Scaffold this active site. Structure first.
Site, PDB file in Angstrom:
ATOM      1  N   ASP A 286      -6.395   8.464   9.653  1.00  6.18           N
ATOM      2  CA  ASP A 286      -5.095   7.917  10.016  1.00  6.18           C
ATOM      3  C   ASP A 286      -4.792   8.181  11.483  1.00  6.18           C
ATOM      4  O   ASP A 286      -5.110   9.250  12.012  1.00  6.18           O
ATOM      5  CB  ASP A 286      -3.997   8.508   9.133  1.00  6.18           C
TER       6      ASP A 286
ATOM      7  N   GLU B 130       0.865  -1.179   0.000  1.00  3.89           N
ATOM      8  CA  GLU B 130       0.000   0.000   0.000  1.00  3.89           C
ATOM      9  C   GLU B 130       0.901   1.229   0.000  1.00  3.89           C
ATOM     10  O   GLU B 130       1.460   1.598   1.035  1.00  3.89           O
ATOM     11  CB  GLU B 130      -0.937   0.008   1.207  1.00  3.89           C
TER      12      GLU B 130
END
Ligand SMILES: Cc1cc(F)c(-c2ccc([C@H]3[C@H](C#N)N[C@H]3CF)cc2)c(F)c1
Ligand SMILES: Cc1cc(F)c(-c2ccc([C@H]3[C@H](C#N)N[C@H]3CF)cc2)c(F)c1
Lengths: 405, 249, 400, 249
Positions: D61, D50
């Site tokens: 995040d 990723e």
């Protein structure tokens, strides 16, 4: 149009007899301008064009009418009585004092006066006066004690942003009552072009009557509102009492209502027995002070005792003469409220209704809670929320340890 | 019947001079010193003494006297000390009136204060924050105890109020204040023959002389407090210079 | 429903302003709020609760005041001030928080979170939560908490909790990012009371609907006092809630000019501004497709303004649509211009305006000079300037 | 017809193991170092990489990845740097998808980003803040350029929204939960589709990877790889080795 004068003093300004409360305890050097103001007010208070001007400013500029709000989440703490808050905290500038300065500033224009002076304690009335003088293009000079100027840096800045001039009173105890004395000396010297915009319902005739009349709008609105929201006249109308302007303004419309209790709550400071208080009716005695015969805090010789309160607006050793008359006549009861009771009420109103009250008004809220317990479940109590507490956040924060060290 | 201060002005008008009227506050710098200074005023040529009762909120007092009365109140001065000062001035052969704001008198009791002041040898009362409109009790006590009542007129006094204030006065009328003072005295003398004292921030012989041209009495207050602050000898000097000024010949 | 978005929250069809640029983790509570709002939107009990609060608690209606002493400085035009500064808590934000807090209690939520910059929306949210007995948590940028101690104390006095956000750049957009993460984790019992007319559907529409009362009153009041519809209605634009509130009632009045004034900081040519429409570009930010200040890669760039309420890099999607449609013009106002209007309104009318609002006044002064004598300009005076007295005292050198 | 990552998950089921899906952000601690680390992931046994596009406001995040992308942006990382990394991973034989918030893609141009991502060897796009409701442009570009579209589901996803999201996904479905929530989410997906399911639970150990390989078609590791890279590239190689061992258990 204009309301009757059933409760007015005589031509000398005396309540309850020609040697009663009020009058004019001023020097002869001031009597010319006092007679000029008395005649000017006597003419304009019945002028429909003057009342139209004031009404216009009260509606579009000041924001009247102020609403009546039922503090349903205060009920539990007031013996399940019903607390209705007359929301003068919502007025432009944030207190009832705007009602007074709008009237007197219109009057000073009507008189051709070009300069306005005023006293102020922590800054509330000076900002209100400077506000009206900016609106009406009058030159403004505010007198403020040197202890209060150094302590109220932003209020001095407000008054200057509004175009007024601030003078530091470095004589006497350098606070509210010495600002008043300094303004009094200014007026004696400048009566020709200067109007004295007095901050409460005290002083010599015609100032107790005039200030009370510019504040009667509070009680007139509240009496209509409480009947529409509660369906009947209230069991009691309460307010805090410094000089008396906001109390007399909400009391007046209810005077001839026989079943309506009228209670004024004054600043007891640390306690009426500590000698650090401002409980004028509770611990003072009759005497001549600041132009009227009324109650004041004085020692055995007649000297003024310095008052103390956690609020600035109630920190005043005198009280207006119309309250003294109403006390003597038994129409109104005057009761003390300590610093702690008020701060307790201040915080409870913040948490329960989301209204940050002025610490002056918290005294009235505090007393209203006590009265609700006495009167019991379902009692309708109208409270004059005389001002908002933005000016008092720092003082309250310190009290409740919200600033730390 | 004649006023208590009547013969004093008669004697002065006979000797082609004005009465020198000196003010000092009780208890400044302390009670004994102020009594010593008031006694010195009698010994130095003061025809009338104004014994000031120090008040916590003296609106009409200028900075010099305000600071003195603040100091005197810090020293714990009492209203009864003013009565004792008057007794001292009587014993010293002087003539004392009392200048006081009204609230101490109300607190003491108006009839009680007139009685005790008269017993103390006092001749009258100067009331700077008491206008005739509020003087009902005072006028009755003034007659009951044979005390003179000195009210104040001002340049801005209306013709109606000026005549009323003069008609209500006894002893002299206090004209407090370029050319405003003589014009004020003229207005009083246009309606009455009562003596007129003039307060004008006098601090020199020359100023005292100018006022004596048109006034029956020259009132000196601030300058004496300043002279006393320097010392008793300076106060004696100044008062002698002022006693010379009021004398025309 | 005439200017409303579609079921997905998009204004203007193919251009796609608005929408829901949020993670799937938030779509269940967003659909719950949307469903709850469309239900109470037409509930008479809900509307009667809100109207009662607006009247008796908030002080509505706010007055319309003709500031005649400003006229000489506005080309002899006639400036009318819609006095939102007189509202409870002192700004229009009380309108929004009352509606959303009543909704949150209708929804059964027991916790309300909200973001704030200098403290305005945080105090308003804590106010409404204290009133309705809702637990309240305010997210505030760490740079803001450090210099706004009294606003933090206001919120604490009101019974709320304040969380200083040290992530990101510690400012308003970072407090919004942190309140977002809270809502993701606590959506079961938490309602996010957003502070402007941005965010994902239904927030731009819902917030505007709670502010519509400003324009509706103002449209009645200006016909009453002046006898006709105004020549222009102006307001300052941060995220867009007070502007869209006063604009909306005038949208279908074809003679009424609408001008939103945004913060130009030190100048648009300086890179220290908050002029989203003047210098930004379309992008997806904070759950909506609208305009924002961004770089070539689409990264958010820092905004600057002497005003705290306009110091926001984004703008609501309905404004982006009204700009694309040509219905509203968006013009920049600098720090200097705003502060000059701040002082002028103090000296002329005795009204101390929020520095945000002084941008609108400053723009009205310029617009009156160009519209000429007798032109009627309604200005939304969104807030009072008590909070700004110290900022303005320094600016005019009145301290020390 | 088949997805691009289809062969990768096919090879994983045929070897009795889940896929090891490793995330790193471009430009942390700088662009060359991040590419060196992404190459090291391919060598150390990562099945799918990723490549993260650092974004100025990464709402989804956590702190370990947000502080790394803050550092990368402070270092001046550009979106084109992510495409160079995808190219390097591809040349090294690795299999790379890009994870990014949607505004950098709007700024680039959705069809242009898909084109240039396809041209770099990238296999798919993970879109944490793009729901299918707003994915019209993305769906078109995803088909035109033959890229997998990895949408996210959540424990709170409604039945209708989970089915719609699974239906719009290609390659695999990212099931995000950052104790019994993750397996239940994978159960809900496999009850409506056979698409592979990736799981991210903040895996940091060999045992945590094995626990997830018991029910998930892929184990996603992100924060742990960033923390390991901060310590050093040898620590990254070690931890990625242990994670490649966990997925075969
Ligand atoms: C509207 C208004 C007007 C006033 F003249 C006064 C006032 C009156 C008298 C004094 C002086 C008095 C004397 N000489 N002794 C001081 C304190 F009482 C000060 C102020 C006031 F308070 C309000
Ligand atoms: C009422 C309301 C609701 C919201 F969900 C948001 C919102 C949406 C997304 C984000 C995230 C996005 C992701 N993931 N990237 C961050 C910055 F955009 C933050 C906040 C908001 F601002 C207001």
């Amino acid at each position: 149009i204009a309301e009757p004068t059933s409760h007015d003093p005589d031509s000398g300004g005396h309540f309850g007899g020609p040697s009663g409360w009020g009058g004019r305890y001023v020097p002869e050097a001031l009597m010319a301008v006092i007679e000029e103001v008395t005649a000017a007010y006597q003419k304009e208070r019945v002028s429909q064009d003057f009342l139209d001007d004031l009404d216009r400013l009260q509606a579009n500029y000041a924001g009247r009418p102020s609403p009546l709000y039922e503090a349903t989440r205060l009920s539990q703490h007031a013996g399940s009585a019903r607390i209705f808050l007359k929301r003068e905290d919502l007025n432009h500038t944030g207190s009832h004092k705007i009602n007074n300065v709008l009237g007197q500033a219109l009057l000073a224009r009507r008189m051709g006066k070009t300069r306005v002076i005023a006293e102020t304690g922590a800054g509330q009335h000076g900002v209100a006066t400077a506000t009206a003088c900016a609106l009406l293009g009058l030159d403004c000079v505010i007198y403020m004690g040197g202890i209060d100027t150094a302590r109220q840096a932003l209020n001095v800045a407000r008054m200057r942003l509004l175009g007024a001039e601030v003078v530091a009173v470095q004589t006497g105890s350098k606070t509210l009552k010495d600002a008043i004395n300094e303004a009094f000396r200014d007026w004696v010297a400048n009566a020709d072009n200067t109007y004295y915009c007095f901050g409460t319902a005290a002083g010599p005739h015609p100032f107790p009557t005039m200030v009370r009349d510019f504040q009667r709008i509070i009680g007139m609105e509240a009496r209509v509102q409480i009947q529409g929201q509660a369906g009947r006249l209230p069991d009691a109308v309460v307010a805090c009492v410094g000089g008396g302007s906001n109390a007399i303004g909400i009391f007046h419309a209810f005077l001839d209502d026989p079943g309506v209790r009228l209670v004024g709550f004054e600043a007891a400071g640390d306690g009426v027995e500590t000698g650090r208080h401002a409980a004028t009716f509770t611990a003072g005695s009759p005497g001549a002070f600041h132009g009227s015969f009324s109650y004041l805090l004085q020692d055995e010789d007649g000297q003024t005792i310095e008052s103390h309160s956690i609020s600035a607006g109630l920190d005043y050793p005198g009280v207006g003469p119309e309250h003294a008359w109403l006390k003597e006549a038994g129409r109104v009861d005057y009761r003390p409220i300590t610093d702690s009771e008020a701060m307790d009420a201040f915080g409870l109103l913040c948490r329960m209704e989301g209204i940050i009250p002025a610490i002056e008004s918290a005294h009235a809220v505090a007393g209203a809670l006590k009265l609700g317990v006495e009167l019991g479940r379902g009692a309708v109590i109208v409270v004059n929320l005389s001002g908002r507490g933005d000016k008092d956040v720092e003082t309250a924060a310190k009290w409740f340890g919200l600033l730390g060290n | 019947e004649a006023s208590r201060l009547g013969p004093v002005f008669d004697s002065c008008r006979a000797n082609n001079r004005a009465a020198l009227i000196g003010y000092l506050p009780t208890g400044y710098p302390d009670v004994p010193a102020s009594v010593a200074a008031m006694t010195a005023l009698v010994e130095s040529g003061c025809d009338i003494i104004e014994v000031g009762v120090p008040y916590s909120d003296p609106g009409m007092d200028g900075p010099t006297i305000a600071r003195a009365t603040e100091a005197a109140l810090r020293g714990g001065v009492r209203v009864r000390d003013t009565l004792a000062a008057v007794e001292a001035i009587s014993i010293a052969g002087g003539r004392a009136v009392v200048m006081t704001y009204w609230n101490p008198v109300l607190r003491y009791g108006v009839d009680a204060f007139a009685r005790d002041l008269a017993a103390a040898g006092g001749l009258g009362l100067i009331t700077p924050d008491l206008i005739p409109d509020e003087a009902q009790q005072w006028l009755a006590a003034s007659e009951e105890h044979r005390l003179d009542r000195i009210f104040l007129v001002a340049p801005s006094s209306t013709p109606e109020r000026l005549a009323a204030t003069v008609e209500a006065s006894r002893g002299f009328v206090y004209a407090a204040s370029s050319q405003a003072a003589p014009e004020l005295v003229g207005r009083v003398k246009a309606v009455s023959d009562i003596p007129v004292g003039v307060g004008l921030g006098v601090r020199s012989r020359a100023q005292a002389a100018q006022i004596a041209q048109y006034a029956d009495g020259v009132i000196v207050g601030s300058a004496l407090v300043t002279a006393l602050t320097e010392g008793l000898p300076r106060l004696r000097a100044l008062t002698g210079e002022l006693a010379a000024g009021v004398r025309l010949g």
